[PDB]
Amino acid sequence: KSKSSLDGKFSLFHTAVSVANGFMHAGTTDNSFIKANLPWLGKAQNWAKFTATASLGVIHKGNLLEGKKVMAPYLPGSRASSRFIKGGSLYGLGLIYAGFGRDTTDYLKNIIVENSGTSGDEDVDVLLHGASLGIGLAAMGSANIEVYEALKEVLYNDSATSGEAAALGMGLCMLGTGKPEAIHDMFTYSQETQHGNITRGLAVGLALINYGRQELADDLITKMLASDESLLRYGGAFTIALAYAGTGNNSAVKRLLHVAVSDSNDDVRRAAVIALGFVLLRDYTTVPRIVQLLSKSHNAHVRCGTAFALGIACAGKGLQSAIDVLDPLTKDPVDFVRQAAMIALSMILIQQTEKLNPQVADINKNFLSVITNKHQEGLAKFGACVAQGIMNAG
Amino acid sequence: QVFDERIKFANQLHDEYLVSMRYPEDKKTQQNEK
Amino acid sequence: TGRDDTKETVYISSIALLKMLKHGRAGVPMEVMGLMLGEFVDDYTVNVVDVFAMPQSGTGVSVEAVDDVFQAKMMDMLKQTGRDQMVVGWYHSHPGFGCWLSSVDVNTQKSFEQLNSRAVAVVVDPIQSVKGKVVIDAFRLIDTGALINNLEPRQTTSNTGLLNKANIQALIHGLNRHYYSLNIDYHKTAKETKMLMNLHKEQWQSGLKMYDYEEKEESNLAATKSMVKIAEQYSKRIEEEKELTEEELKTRYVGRQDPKKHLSETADETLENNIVSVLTAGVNSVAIK
Amino acid sequence: MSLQHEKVTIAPLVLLSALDHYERTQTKENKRCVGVILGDANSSTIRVTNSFALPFEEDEKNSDVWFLDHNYIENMNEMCKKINAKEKLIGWYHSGPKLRASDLKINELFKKYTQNNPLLLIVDVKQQGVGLPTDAYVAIEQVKDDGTSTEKTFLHLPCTIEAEEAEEIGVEHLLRDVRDQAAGGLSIRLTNQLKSLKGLQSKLKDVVEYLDKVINKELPINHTILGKLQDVFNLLPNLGTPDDDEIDVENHDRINISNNLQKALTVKTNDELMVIYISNLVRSIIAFDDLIENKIQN
C-alpha cells in the first residue's frame, strides 16, 4: 500500500518507504520485496539513492556470513551506476558489520588515508562522505586516536560535502573521552569554517565527545550556549543531553527550560526540548509531567520537540499519560509537529499488541489514512510511513 | 507622613485580591460544565 | 551530473537589507533595481555582503536597464575601495504585487543566468507585506528540460525550503516554474547591533529635564475633574449588571462606551506621570546642591 | 554660506553604514577613513540619507601629509544624483575618535564643492557612551577678538535622529528587543533616569581632571572656559531659601493626587473580584446539573 501511493521520482517519497522497509525486515535477510519492486528502487537519484543502498544494511543488521558478499557489487572499485551507490555502500557495510566491526575498520581506513592528500571531482567527494560514516560505525567506541587524526585531515582538505560526514564520524569513534585536545580544535575551527554543513557537524560532535562526563562536562556546556552563533548553541543543548544521560538531575532540567524560553533562534528552541528526553529516562513517568507545560507553548518548534522527548523517554513500556499529550499534536496544522508526533508514537508503542490495548490498533489505522490521502502534505505522508515500519519492526 | 500610611494600606489590598481571584475559577473549570 | 543543484539559501546581511528597503520604498510604485555583491560558498550558501543601486529607468526593470557603461564606472570605483566583488545576483522590487516573477522579469533573469549560474532574484515587497516580518522571497530560474523530467526534487535537496502559498495553486505553480523559494536569514554582528540600538544622545539630559511647572498644575486639575464626569457614567453602568449573559448586555442596551475602561486608563496614565515628577524634582534638588 | 543647519537628523542607515565602511577599507590601528556623506540639507533640518567611502591614506608622522583622491568624489556623486536628486554633496564623515585641528585641512577641500558649510560628522568607531557615539559639527566662521582676528572653529550642534517608515520596520525586525531608549512606559522611564544620573557623574569627573592638568602640567590658561565654570557656581541653588519651602508645598499636592488615583484603582480591582465571582456562582449550578445528566447518559 505504501509503495503504490508513494512514487519513486520524488526523492522524499522514495526515502520514507525505503527506511521503513528496512525496519520491517530488520535484524534478518529478506530482499524479496526489493527485487520484485526493483524498477521502483532505480528511479531514485541523488541522496535518495544513497539512502536506498544504506537501507540494504538495515535489513541485513546482524548477518555476517553474507555480510560482505551481498554489498560486494556495490562497493567502489566495482561497477556501479553512480557515485551515490559507491558512497552508501560503505555506510551499509558498516551497519551489517556493526558491533564486530574491527575488520571493516581496517578496510575502510585504506580509502580515507588514500584520499586525504588531495581530492578530485565530485565522485571522490561523495565516496569520502560515505567512507567517514562507515569508519564511525566500524570503530564505534574504540576511541582510536590515530583514526581521529585522519579524519581531521578530511576537514582541512576541504571538500565541503565530506565535511559533514567526518564531523559526525569523530564523535561516533571517540565517544566519551572528552579528550581535551579534541574539544579545543573543534571549537576554534567552527568559527573559521563558513560552510553550514561542516559547522552543523562539529556542533553535534562537541556534544557527542563528552559522554558520561556528567559534572566534568560542566565547562563545555556553558561556553557553547554563550556563543552568538546559533549553530554552537544548537550543539550546546545536546552537550547537556549526552553528558548527564541516564540520571535525573535538578541542574540539567532548569538550564533547559530556561533556554527554550529565552532564545529566539527557532532551531535552538526545538533542540533543548528534545534534550529533556534523554536525561530523565531514569523515572520515565516524570517526562509526561515535565513537557505538559511546554506543550502549551504556541511556538511551533517547542511543540515538535515535545513529541520527540516522550519518544526517547518511554521507549520500553507504554505510558497512558504520554499519549494524552500527543493526541492534540497529531491534529495540529503545523506540518512537522505532526511528523514528529506520529514518529514518536511508534517508538513508545513498539511491540505492544493490538488486542491488549485498542489504542495501539487505532494509531496504526490513523497512519494508513494519512498515506492514502493526497489532501495531506508530503511531510506528514513521510511521517506516517516511517512510523508503521517502526511498529511492525518487520 | 500621613499619606504614607494611606498609600501603604491601599497597595496591600490590591495584592490580596489578586491572589484570591484565580483560585475559585480553577475549581469550577476542572469540574464538568458547558 | 551528480551536481546537487541545491538552491540558494540567501544569507543577506543586515546592511544589505536596510539599503534595499530604502531604495525600494522611494521608488513606489515603479519597480527599482540594482545588483548584489557578495561571495558564493558551499553549494547553497550565497552570502550577500552589500548591494549597489542602478538609476531608475522608464522600463520598469528590463534587460535594457542593464547598462554596461553605468556598471563599468561604478565597479571601477569600488575597486579603489576594495569593495569590488563578484556579482551573485540582482535585487528588485515588485511593490505593487506580492512576491513573484512575471514574464518580463523572467527575461531579465535569463540574461542574469548566463552571467552567473547561481544568480538569485530576491523580490522585496516592502509595503503590502502581510507579516510584520518584511515578506521577501528569493527565486532562481530552473530550466525546462529538468522540470519536465521532474528533476525538481533533485533541485530541492539539502534545503528544508520555505512555503509560499498566498495565491494558492497559481502561486505554487509560478514559484516552481521560476525557481523555488528558499529561506532568507540575517547575519548580523554585535558592532552593527549596538549602533542601531542607541538612538538618543540626549538621554542623559532629558531624564534630568523636568517639565515647566505651570503645566503640571494645569494638568492635575484637568485629570481629577474629568474623572468626576466619567464616575457619573460609571454609576449608570452598574445600575444594570443584571441582564442574562454579559455579552447580551453589551448588545441590547449598548454597554459599549465603557466608562470602566476610561477611568482605569486615566487613573494609571496620571499615576505614572506623578511618580516620575516627584522623583525627578527630588533627585535634582539633592544631587546638584 | 548658509546658517541653515540648526538640527541634524541622521537616518539609521548612515550610522550603520559608516561603521561598516571602516573595516571594508581595512583602516584600523588608529587610521582614519573619510567618506562622503550624501543627503538633503539647505534647510534647518539636515537629513543624512547615505554615505560612501573615499580612498584614504593616513600618515601619522606628518599630519600635513594625507591622501584624498578629489576627482573620485565628484564622478561617483553625479551618478547618485540621477537615481535620487535628494542626495547632494552635503559634506564628509570622519571616523573619529576625536575632533582634530587636522580635520580643518580636509574641510577646506570639500568646501569648494559645497554650497552650505560642510557638515563634519564624527562617527566615533570606539562606540563609547550610553548615548550615540556621533557628534555633529558645522564649520562656523566668526569674527572674534582674543588676540586672534577672525576665528574659524567647529561648534557643537546637538544630535538627534530621524527614521523613514520602511527603515524603521526593518530596525525592529532585526531586534528581539522591545527597546529601552524608547522613553516608553513607567518602567522604561525610571530606567532612563538612572542612566541619566550615571551619565552626569562621568561628565563632571572629566571637568575636574582638566583643571588639574592646568595647575600641574601647565596647559596654558584658557580664560574662556573658567568664565563659564564661574557662572555654574553663581547660579547654583542654595538651601535655607523659602524657594525650598515652595517645592515642599508643591510636593504635597502631587502626593494628594497619587493617593486619590491609587484609591480609585482599589475600587476597580474590587469590582473585578465580585464580577468574576458571579460568573463562578453560575458555573457551580451548571456543573451540579451537568453531572446528574451524565449519570443518565452513562
Coordinates of C-alpha atoms in Angstrom, one line a residue, chain C:
Chain C
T1 CA 25.5 15.1 -13.5
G2 CA 25.6 14.4 -9.8
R3 CA 25.5 18.1 -9.2
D4 CA 23.2 18.6 -6.4
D5 CA 22.0 21.9 -7.9
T6 CA 21.0 22.7 -4.3
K7 CA 19.1 26.1 -4.5
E8 CA 20.5 29.1 -2.8
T9 CA 19.7 29.9 0.8
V10 CA 20.4 33.6 0.7
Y11 CA 22.2 34.9 3.8
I12 CA 21.5 38.5 3.3
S13 CA 23.5 40.7 5.8
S14 CA 21.8 43.3 7.9
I15 CA 23.5 46.2 5.9
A16 CA 22.2 44.8 2.6
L17 CA 18.7 44.5 3.9
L18 CA 18.3 48.1 5.0
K19 CA 19.7 49.6 1.9
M20 CA 17.3 47.7 -0.4
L21 CA 14.3 48.7 1.8
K22 CA 15.4 52.3 1.4
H23 CA 15.8 52.1 -2.4
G24 CA 12.6 50.4 -2.9
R25 CA 10.1 52.5 -0.8
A26 CA 11.2 55.7 -2.5
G27 CA 10.5 54.3 -6.0
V28 CA 6.9 53.3 -5.0
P29 CA 5.1 52.1 -7.1
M30 CA 7.6 51.8 -10.0
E31 CA 9.9 48.8 -9.7
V32 CA 13.5 49.6 -8.5
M33 CA 16.6 47.5 -9.1
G34 CA 20.3 47.3 -8.7
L35 CA 22.8 44.5 -8.2
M36 CA 24.1 42.3 -5.3
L37 CA 27.7 41.9 -4.5
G38 CA 28.8 39.0 -2.5
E39 CA 30.6 35.7 -2.5
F40 CA 29.2 32.2 -3.0
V41 CA 30.4 29.4 -0.8
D42 CA 29.5 25.9 -0.2
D43 CA 27.0 25.0 -3.0
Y44 CA 23.9 26.7 -1.3
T45 CA 25.2 29.5 0.9
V46 CA 25.2 32.6 -1.1
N47 CA 26.3 35.5 1.1
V48 CA 25.2 39.0 0.1
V49 CA 27.6 41.5 1.7
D50 CA 26.2 44.6 0.2
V51 CA 24.1 45.9 -2.9
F52 CA 24.7 48.8 -5.2
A53 CA 21.8 50.6 -7.0
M54 CA 21.0 51.2 -10.8
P55 CA 19.5 54.6 -11.7
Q56 CA 15.6 54.1 -12.2
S57 CA 14.6 53.8 -15.8
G58 CA 11.3 54.1 -17.6
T59 CA 11.0 50.5 -18.4
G60 CA 10.1 49.0 -15.0
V61 CA 13.1 46.6 -14.7
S62 CA 14.2 45.1 -18.0
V63 CA 17.4 43.8 -19.6
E64 CA 17.7 47.2 -21.2
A65 CA 18.1 48.6 -17.7
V66 CA 21.4 46.6 -17.5
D67 CA 23.7 49.3 -19.0
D68 CA 27.3 48.4 -19.4
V69 CA 28.6 52.0 -19.1
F70 CA 27.0 52.6 -15.6
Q71 CA 28.3 49.2 -14.5
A72 CA 31.9 49.6 -15.5
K73 CA 32.1 53.0 -13.9
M74 CA 30.5 52.1 -10.7
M75 CA 32.6 48.9 -10.4
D76 CA 36.0 50.6 -11.1
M77 CA 35.3 53.0 -8.3
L78 CA 34.5 50.1 -5.9
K79 CA 37.9 48.7 -6.9
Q80 CA 39.6 51.5 -5.2
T81 CA 37.8 50.9 -2.0
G82 CA 38.5 47.1 -2.4
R83 CA 34.8 46.7 -2.4
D84 CA 34.6 45.2 -5.7
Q85 CA 33.5 41.6 -5.7
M86 CA 31.6 39.1 -7.8
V87 CA 28.0 39.6 -8.9
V88 CA 26.0 36.9 -7.2
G89 CA 22.6 38.2 -8.4
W90 CA 20.2 41.1 -8.7
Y91 CA 17.5 42.6 -6.5
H92 CA 14.4 44.1 -7.5
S93 CA 11.1 45.2 -6.1
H94 CA 7.6 44.3 -7.0
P95 CA 5.9 46.7 -4.6
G96 CA 2.5 46.8 -6.4
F97 CA 2.2 42.9 -6.4
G98 CA 3.1 40.1 -4.0
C99 CA 6.3 38.3 -4.4
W100 CA 6.6 36.5 -7.8
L101 CA 8.4 36.9 -11.2
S102 CA 6.4 37.8 -14.2
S103 CA 7.4 37.2 -17.9
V104 CA 9.3 40.5 -18.2
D105 CA 11.3 39.7 -15.1
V106 CA 11.9 36.1 -16.3
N107 CA 13.8 37.5 -19.4
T108 CA 15.7 39.8 -17.1
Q109 CA 16.6 36.7 -15.0
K110 CA 17.5 34.8 -18.1
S111 CA 20.2 37.1 -19.0
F112 CA 21.3 37.0 -15.4
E113 CA 21.7 33.2 -15.5
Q114 CA 24.2 33.3 -18.4
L115 CA 26.3 35.8 -16.5
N116 CA 26.4 33.8 -13.4
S117 CA 24.9 30.3 -12.9
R118 CA 23.7 30.8 -9.2
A119 CA 22.3 34.4 -9.8
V120 CA 19.3 34.9 -7.5
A121 CA 16.5 37.4 -7.8
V122 CA 15.2 38.5 -4.3
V123 CA 11.9 40.3 -4.5
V124 CA 11.3 42.8 -1.8
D125 CA 7.7 43.7 -1.4
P126 CA 8.1 46.4 1.3
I127 CA 4.5 47.7 2.0
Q128 CA 1.8 45.1 1.3
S129 CA 3.7 42.6 3.5
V130 CA 1.1 40.5 5.4
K131 CA 3.6 40.0 8.3
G132 CA 5.4 42.4 10.3
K133 CA 8.5 40.5 9.3
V134 CA 9.1 42.0 5.7
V135 CA 7.7 39.3 3.3
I136 CA 10.7 38.7 1.0
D137 CA 11.1 35.7 -1.2
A138 CA 14.1 34.5 -3.2
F139 CA 13.8 33.0 -6.7
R140 CA 16.1 31.4 -9.3
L141 CA 15.2 30.2 -12.7
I142 CA 15.0 26.5 -13.3
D143 CA 15.5 25.3 -16.9
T144 CA 12.5 23.4 -18.7
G145 CA 14.4 20.2 -19.6
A146 CA 15.0 19.5 -15.9
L147 CA 11.4 20.5 -14.9
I148 CA 9.7 18.2 -17.4
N149 CA 11.5 15.1 -16.3
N150 CA 10.8 16.0 -12.7
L151 CA 14.5 16.7 -11.6
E152 CA 12.8 19.4 -9.4
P153 CA 13.1 17.1 -6.3
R154 CA 16.8 17.0 -7.1
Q155 CA 17.0 20.8 -7.0
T156 CA 15.2 20.8 -3.5
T157 CA 17.7 18.6 -1.9
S158 CA 19.6 19.9 1.2
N159 CA 17.2 22.6 1.8
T160 CA 14.1 22.4 4.1
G161 CA 12.9 25.1 1.9
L162 CA 10.1 27.6 2.5
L163 CA 6.4 27.7 1.9
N164 CA 4.8 30.3 -0.1
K165 CA 1.0 29.6 -0.6
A166 CA -0.9 33.0 -0.6
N167 CA -2.3 32.8 -4.3
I168 CA -2.8 29.0 -3.8
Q169 CA -2.3 26.8 -6.9
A170 CA -1.3 29.8 -9.1
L171 CA 1.3 30.9 -6.5
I172 CA 2.8 27.4 -6.2
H173 CA 2.9 26.8 -9.9
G174 CA 4.6 30.2 -10.5
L175 CA 7.1 29.7 -7.8
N176 CA 8.1 26.2 -9.0
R177 CA 8.3 27.3 -12.7
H178 CA 10.6 30.3 -11.7
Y179 CA 12.9 28.5 -9.3
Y180 CA 11.7 27.6 -5.9
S181 CA 11.7 29.8 -2.8
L182 CA 14.2 29.4 -0.1
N183 CA 14.8 30.7 3.4
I184 CA 16.2 34.2 3.8
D185 CA 18.3 34.5 7.0
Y186 CA 20.1 37.6 8.6
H187 CA 23.8 37.5 9.6
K188 CA 24.3 40.5 12.0
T189 CA 27.4 41.5 14.1
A190 CA 27.4 42.9 17.5
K191 CA 29.1 46.0 16.4
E192 CA 26.3 46.6 13.9
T193 CA 23.6 45.8 16.6
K194 CA 24.9 48.3 19.2
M195 CA 24.8 51.1 16.6
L196 CA 21.1 50.5 15.7
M197 CA 20.3 50.2 19.3
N198 CA 21.5 53.6 20.6
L199 CA 19.3 56.3 19.0
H200 CA 19.2 59.0 21.7
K201 CA 22.3 61.0 22.6
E202 CA 20.1 63.3 24.7
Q203 CA 19.2 60.6 27.1
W204 CA 21.5 62.0 29.9
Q205 CA 19.9 65.4 29.7
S206 CA 16.2 64.6 29.1
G207 CA 15.7 62.4 32.2
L208 CA 17.0 65.1 34.5
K209 CA 14.9 67.5 32.5
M210 CA 11.6 68.2 34.2
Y211 CA 8.6 70.0 32.6
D212 CA 8.0 73.7 33.4
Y213 CA 5.7 73.8 36.4
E214 CA 2.7 75.8 35.2
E215 CA 1.9 72.9 33.0
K216 CA 1.9 70.3 35.8
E217 CA -0.6 72.2 37.9
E218 CA -2.8 72.7 35.0
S219 CA -2.8 69.1 34.1
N220 CA -3.7 67.7 37.6
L221 CA -6.9 69.7 37.9
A222 CA -8.0 68.6 34.4
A223 CA -7.4 64.9 35.2
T224 CA -9.4 64.9 38.6
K225 CA -12.2 67.0 37.3
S226 CA -12.6 64.9 34.2
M227 CA -12.8 61.6 36.2
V228 CA -15.8 63.2 38.2
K229 CA -17.7 63.1 34.9
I230 CA -16.6 59.5 33.9
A231 CA -17.7 58.5 37.6
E232 CA -21.2 59.6 36.8
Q233 CA -21.2 57.4 33.8
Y234 CA -19.7 54.6 35.9
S235 CA -22.8 54.8 38.2
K236 CA -25.1 54.1 35.2
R237 CA -23.1 51.2 34.1
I238 CA -23.7 49.2 37.4
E239 CA -27.4 50.1 37.5
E240 CA -27.7 47.2 35.1
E241 CA -25.4 44.3 35.5
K242 CA -28.5 42.0 35.7
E243 CA -29.3 41.1 32.0
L244 CA -28.8 37.5 31.3
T245 CA -25.4 36.9 29.7
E246 CA -22.7 39.5 29.9
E247 CA -22.5 39.6 26.1
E248 CA -26.3 40.2 25.7
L249 CA -26.0 43.3 27.9
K250 CA -23.3 44.7 25.7
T251 CA -25.6 44.4 22.6
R252 CA -29.1 45.1 24.0
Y253 CA -28.5 48.3 26.0
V254 CA -25.3 49.3 24.1
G255 CA -23.0 48.7 27.0
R256 CA -20.1 49.7 25.0
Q257 CA -18.8 53.2 25.5
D258 CA -17.4 51.7 28.6
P259 CA -16.8 54.1 31.5
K260 CA -14.9 51.4 33.4
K261 CA -12.2 51.3 30.8
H262 CA -11.8 55.1 30.7
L263 CA -11.4 55.6 34.3
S264 CA -8.9 52.8 34.6
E265 CA -6.8 54.2 31.7
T266 CA -6.8 57.7 33.0
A267 CA -6.0 56.9 36.5
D268 CA -2.9 54.7 35.6
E269 CA -1.7 57.4 33.0
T270 CA -1.8 60.2 35.5
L271 CA -0.4 57.9 38.2
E272 CA 2.9 57.1 36.4
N273 CA 3.3 60.7 35.4
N274 CA 3.2 61.8 39.0
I275 CA 5.7 59.1 40.1
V276 CA 8.3 60.4 37.7
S277 CA 7.5 64.0 38.6
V278 CA 8.1 63.6 42.3
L279 CA 11.2 61.5 41.7
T280 CA 12.9 63.9 39.2
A281 CA 12.4 67.0 41.1
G282 CA 13.5 65.5 44.4
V283 CA 16.7 63.9 42.8
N284 CA 17.7 67.2 41.2
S285 CA 17.4 69.1 44.4
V286 CA 19.8 66.9 46.3
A287 CA 22.3 66.0 43.6
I288 CA 23.0 69.4 42.4
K289 CA 23.1 71.1 45.8

